[PDB]
Amino acid sequence: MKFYIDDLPVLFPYPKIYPEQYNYMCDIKKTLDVGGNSILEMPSGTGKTVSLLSLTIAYQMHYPEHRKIIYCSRTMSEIEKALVELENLMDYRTKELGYQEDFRGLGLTSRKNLCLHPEVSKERKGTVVDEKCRRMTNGQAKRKLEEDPEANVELCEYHENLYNIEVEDYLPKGVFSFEKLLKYCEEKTLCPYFIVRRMISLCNIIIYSYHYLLDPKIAERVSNEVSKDSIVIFDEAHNIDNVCIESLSLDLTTDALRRATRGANALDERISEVRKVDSQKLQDEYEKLVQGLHSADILTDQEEPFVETPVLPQDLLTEAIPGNIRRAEHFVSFLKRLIEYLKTRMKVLHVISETPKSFLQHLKQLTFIERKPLRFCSERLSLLVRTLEVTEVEDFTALKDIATFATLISTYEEGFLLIIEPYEIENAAVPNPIMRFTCLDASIAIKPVFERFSSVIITSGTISPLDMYPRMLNFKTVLQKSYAMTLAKKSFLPMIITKGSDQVAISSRFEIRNDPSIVRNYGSMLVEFAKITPDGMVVFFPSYLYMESIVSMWQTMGILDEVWKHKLILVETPDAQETSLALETYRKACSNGRGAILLSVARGKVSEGIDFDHQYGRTVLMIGIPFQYTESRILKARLEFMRENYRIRENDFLSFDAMRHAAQCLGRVLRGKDDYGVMVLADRRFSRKRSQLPKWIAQGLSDADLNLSTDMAISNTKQFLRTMAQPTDPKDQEGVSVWSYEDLIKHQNSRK
Amino acid sequence: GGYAWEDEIKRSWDLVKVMASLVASIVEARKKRTAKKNITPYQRGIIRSLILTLDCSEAMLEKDLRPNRHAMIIQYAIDFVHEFFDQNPISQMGIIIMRNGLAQLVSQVSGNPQDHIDALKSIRKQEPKGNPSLQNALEMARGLLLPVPAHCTREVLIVFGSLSTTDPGDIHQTIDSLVSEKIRVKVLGLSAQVAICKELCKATNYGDESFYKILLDETHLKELFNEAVTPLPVNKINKGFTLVKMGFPTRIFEDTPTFCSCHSKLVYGGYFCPNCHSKVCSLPTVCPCCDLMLILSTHLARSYHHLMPLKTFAEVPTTEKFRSEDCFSCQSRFPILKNHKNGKLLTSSRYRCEDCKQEFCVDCDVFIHEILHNCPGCESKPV
Ligand code: SF4
Ligand SMILES: [Zn+2]
Ligand SMILES: [Zn+2]
Ligand SMILES: [Zn+2]
Ligand SMILES: [Zn+2]
């Protein structure tokens, strides 16, 4: 409908509206009018994406500032869902206003999801797709073909047609979801990737991952095209701290350094060949480096660095080269002795946990290498690779690795740590030493986002506690509130199972994963659930080796044979193509009434993004708490830094992370208040963690279900599914769970 | 911090914690009749062809319905066939079970209640087993409803107590074929809301989600049957507006037994077909000489009442002056039923009829509205 919040005409694309949705819109408009940070959890079920999209389009069109809108999600599954909801909302707004207004909206992802080249489309890696698409379109190949038309080098017609048509005429006005965008670019023979990369400054909305905002290696080009005074929305912003961690984290193995030695030797051979043939490119590169010209001063806009900048752009050094790495051979020797120093550093029999300052002091006392030449390592290496004009870059990837490590550990000294450990897996017979350069402070990658932008929306369906995140990230909110979603009848039934059918306490600790009693209890409850679940299951466990051991044990003991009678069994696979095939197989088996059970990682690919609405999720079997591996040294480093700086207890953060992964798994089952589904939690340690739960989840959890065994939980589920199968009374839900236009107007008059 | 025994006694005697009792039930009665206050003559499917799909599976061995699911469903299906032939005699009925992964047609489509009851009691003896498949049952129903004429409505009922169906092919193609063949489907599941059955009921019945019903207890199942006997209202876009040629046979009377045209057996009675003078055993049956739907006036008589649904009797306010002390149709004295002297007069048991302004009691209302189908007040009015 079309209603007013203050002076804002809101074109809601549904004939009805939830009350929680409208109070959410009131709070969001208050936040936008005030300006600043805000953390709000909007319960899953109720429409979240379309409501934000409606308020942002109303705010952008109506207000004379016309600030652009930034919408950051976690996966392009959710980005595509948002684009589809935006397509519906723009169709509604065009229908109501009678015209298609001036509006641009696109989603943003990698080349691998946006490559229409028929030859380079079967590659299993995005890196090889990027290196080929650069190789032909760095501009070196085009000018070579201009100079030599008989050259065997090839160009992508999809990119070359983009030069013919004007920038603003790449697409017609409106929204293009990735399916529609790929269909249009297939019809028009265009590259969608370069189109999206060129519409960043022109789109009213651009939707990209947290990687395209937090990780500077790809966000460096993105953030230069967006508006500083733009409204930013963080959707599903509950694992954004994890993304901030991996944005500034790094790992290297001894195979990587062996390939680094091989790449350094190949680079030495290549530079010897260049010095033999033509040293003029080396010469003018040398004088450009003497002049102090940086990489961006010499690299063209249509080409990218060979190794991307791993650090924040505000943390980069604006001064010239120190000159030690200015010559090509000098830089080659410099990087080779980097490789040998780090190789020497791996020969150790215990854990090394030292600060970057301690590492650089050990560096400067073992070799003569300073922080400042390392702070230009990636830039110098990328410039050298560009000026060498090497045809293949397959052998130089470990050079990217070592340049990234050098720049990352040089520029950064606080909030970071280096972990050198001899057994990368403790099950390996032969020692395989590892180094881990980790980012202790998760607030670093989100700090320039808060510095640049003014109005920030942080939102997850299941984020709890609300004040936990202003502690881990140094920012201040203007308001935090959690909504209790109201029901005519209780649509969701959460349980806690603490013991099996024989009242033996069940636990998912990794040391007791092979307990026959606990595994047998788990098999018993899943068999009974598969006997009583109508449509479909998703089942979450803590770890991948946990499914491997436990389904090996039930397949040995014949539980899964009995499961095969009722539902088709689907398991998450590390091959994400096979995992997506299993996912669509599961959805097909849920659609036709075949019945299916999905076994997944609670911290994995299926847990994020993928929603099990309606028949896709009816019972959410939570086997155990998805705790991380505590003995992993990186997690202990997390806990130590949080306790030292932000005064957060180790068990508190451990439990919080485990149950927030549990909660993001639980929130994928409800879409709409007509959707129903239970969230059963099978571990003895969930019983003490109700106070941490999401508030809409917490109000649905009764006192009687805090400690149940299998059988009365099964009876409660049976009664619940008999209850929600009944047709509800519209008079029971006419104005208390959903509002029409008249109910919303009446409540607006009551509030006034 | 002690054991469960060392705390306290249960105090079960103190657990029980302890004229306006009329209103506490009668306001519930108003709330129950609130859903039934809307009534209008819907055009419904009068000539019907029902396919009763029966689950015959290991899920029918479940110990939730007494004594198993199988016996209660088979006896309630016997009851359903009896009452449906008592309310819709001109219809043609086929019975099918779903057993061992194949849809077993246990009786052909027919207008004989007795043969279908015999088929049901024959299936009553056997043990339900196998994994049920919906798609086989819907394909069999599609086959058997193919010779059904355009005027006769194609209808299918399924009692699917299982939760999963294992189909040999795509069931959505079968759903599209049934929608294309204008076959309306109502599904009566026993355990939960199966999504494929929900989609089947929505698509086959023109977007209506109210045709997928799940019981709550023992009595609600019989409620599902006795509102399943009702003719379904047809959609406005359905144009099967035809004339149907049928004749009225006369009961022949003879002391000499003669060969009936249907069975070739000696029957003293019979009904001579007006088109070709052929005798049959039972009515309403088709004439097996000239394919004529031989009937009685009683068979269409049983179906007039759906076309004239009685408007619900509106109970008079207690404040307004009552018309008479006794009821109209049974002249039972209306109970004074005064709660107290301060409790005043509540729940006046007089049910007015809007077309005749005649009051009726509660027993008269609950007799006139389903057993009778006329208002005696509307008939005493000299129009
Ligand atoms: S130019 Fe576009 S279509 Fe061609 S390879 Fe690169 S991303 Fe793919
Ligand atoms: Zn006969
Ligand atoms: Zn005849
Ligand atoms: Zn009476
Ligand atoms: Zn009357």
Short mmCIF file of N, CA, C and O and ligand atoms in Angstrom, two decimals, chain B residues 273 275-276 278 287 289-290 292, ligand 3:
data_model
loop_
_atom_site.label_atom_id
_atom_site.label_comp_id
_atom_site.label_asym_id
_atom_site.label_seq_id
_atom_site.Cartn_x
_atom_site.Cartn_y
_atom_site.Cartn_z
N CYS B 273 -37.55 -49.45 -18.22
CA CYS B 273 -36.99 -48.21 -18.75
C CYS B 273 -38.00 -47.53 -19.67
O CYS B 273 -38.54 -48.18 -20.56
N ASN B 275 -37.46 -45.54 -22.05
CA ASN B 275 -36.96 -45.41 -23.41
C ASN B 275 -37.07 -46.72 -24.18
O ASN B 275 -37.38 -46.72 -25.38
N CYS B 276 -36.83 -47.85 -23.52
CA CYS B 276 -36.74 -49.12 -24.23
C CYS B 276 -37.42 -50.30 -23.54
O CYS B 276 -37.31 -51.42 -24.05
N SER B 278 -36.86 -51.91 -20.49
CA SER B 278 -35.92 -52.86 -19.92
C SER B 278 -35.92 -52.72 -18.41
O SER B 278 -35.92 -51.61 -17.89
N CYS B 287 -29.47 -47.48 -17.54
CA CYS B 287 -30.13 -48.57 -18.24
C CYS B 287 -29.10 -49.30 -19.09
O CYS B 287 -28.51 -48.68 -19.99
N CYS B 289 -29.35 -51.05 -21.62
CA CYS B 289 -29.80 -51.34 -22.97
C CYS B 289 -29.57 -50.13 -23.87
O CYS B 289 -29.02 -50.26 -24.97
N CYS B 290 -29.98 -48.95 -23.40
CA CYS B 290 -29.89 -47.73 -24.20
C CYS B 290 -29.07 -46.64 -23.52
O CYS B 290 -29.09 -45.50 -24.00
N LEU B 292 -29.33 -45.12 -20.40
CA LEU B 292 -30.23 -44.10 -19.89
C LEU B 292 -30.19 -44.12 -18.36
O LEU B 292 -30.34 -45.18 -17.75
ZN ZN C 3 -33.46 -48.31 -21.69
#
